[PDB]
Design a protein around this ligand. Structure first.
Ligand SMILES: NC(=O)c1ccc[n+]([C@@H]2O[C@H](COP(=O)([O-])OP(=O)(O)OC[C@H]3O[C@@H](n4cnc5c(N)ncnc54)[C@H](OP(=O)(O)O)[C@@H]3O)[C@@H](O)[C@H]2O)c1
Length: 315
């Protein structure tokens, strides 16, 4: 539809606006335009370093009465340097301050990896490697569950968890709140059929991040594949008189995924909204799926020997 049902009874807008890499001085206007255009779901994160400026736009549209607060679906995520039981509430409350809300709709564990606490997002040792916390996924999940019981967040979820990491929360003794959502990377070059099949079979909603292949990721190099300019995908968009981005956004939606394309450009924020009015044939969907090449934009490459690195498992 336009919203999917979560295991807590709330409904989550199938389209949201991503805000990673959105400069603090453009994102306020970006979020204001999104909300005006009809977006009702914004994907945030403390590590983005722009939640204060996202929060300025949200407050403005609330006070303008363009939207009521219960119409909005705001998501953020707990960064890896706050996995300690004693740090989780404090990280949540900081995010709530910057965003200027009194609760979140969904709050995700950003990565399954815990890092040493401190002021660096990626703490390094003598030899320049990332310093891990000795915390585990289950301790952190218990801290998250508390935030539901105190009324700070309505739902809790995970991001970049492999199927065995999800299983481990699912089999936790005394598990009180199931993960509502697993936000993972997903597009025609990394189609994630096994992990999406698993999560959907557990009643867990999947959100596809980097739908367009994150052409603005910091580590981009030119040999790299570009979805937005794949001549095969352009042909499919030509056939529907749509843009290739509009096709890349409609693709997850028809797999019953939530999708969160990022833009700070007003015409593109608008273009990206115009995806509810057409449909890919099953032939187009199969063709799109056949393009997989197991290519990840985000492989958290500095943590490949972390005890909790998610991407050594098949899925
Ligand atoms: N949970 C995680 O670990 C994680 C990791 C990565 C991403 N995410 C979430 O997923 C969101 C989306 O992922 P992403 O930011 O990597 O990349 P993306 O959404 O795949 O691509 C964003 C890039 O595509 C461009 N773009 C937007 N609309 C376009 C259009 N219609 N035509 C051409 N180009 C277009 C943007 O340009 P302009 O802004 O220049 O318009 C920006 O350069 C993030 O912002 C974040 O909120 C989460």
């Amino acid at each position: 539809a336009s919203r999917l049902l979560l295991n807590n009874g709330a409904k989550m807008p199938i389209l949201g606006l991503g805000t990673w890499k959105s400069p603090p001085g453009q994102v306020t206007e970006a979020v204001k335009v999104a909300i005006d255009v009809g977006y009702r779901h914004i994907d945030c994160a403390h590590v983005h370093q722009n939640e204060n400026e996202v929060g300025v736009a949200i407050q403005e549209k609330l006070r303008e009465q363009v939207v009521k607060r219960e119409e909005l679906f705001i998501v953020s995520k707990l960064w890896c340097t706050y996995h300690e039981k004693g740090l989780v509430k404090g990280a949540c409350q900081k995010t709530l301050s910057d965003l200027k809300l009194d609760y979140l709709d969904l709050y995700l564990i950003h990565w399954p990896t815990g890092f040493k606490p401190g002021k660096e997002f990626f703490p390094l040792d003598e030899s320049g490697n990332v310093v891990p916390s000795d915390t585990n996924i289950l301790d952190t999940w218990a801290a998250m569950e508390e935030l539901v019981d105190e009324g700070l967040v309505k739902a809790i979820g995970i991001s970049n968890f492999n199927h065995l990491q999800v299983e481990m929360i699912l089999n936790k003794p005394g598990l009180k709140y199931k993960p509502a959502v697993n936000q993972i990377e997903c597009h025609p070059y990394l189609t994630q059929e096994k992990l999406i099949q698993y999560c959907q079979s557990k009643g867990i909603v999947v959100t596809a991040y980097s739908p367009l292949g994150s052409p603005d990721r910091p580590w981009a190099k030119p040999e790299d594949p570009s979805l937005l300019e794949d001549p095969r995908i352009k042909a499919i968009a030509a056939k529907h008189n749509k843009t290739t981005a509009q096709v890349l956004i409609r693709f997850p939606m028809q797999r019953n995924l939530v999708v969160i394309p990022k833009s700070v450009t007003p015409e593109r924020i608008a273009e990206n909204f115009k995806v509810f009015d057409f449909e890919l044939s099953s032939q187009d969907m199969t063709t799109l799926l056949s393009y997989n090449r197991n290519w990840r934009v985000c492989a958290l490459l500095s943590c490949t020997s972390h005890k909790d690195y998610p991407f050594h498992e098949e899925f």
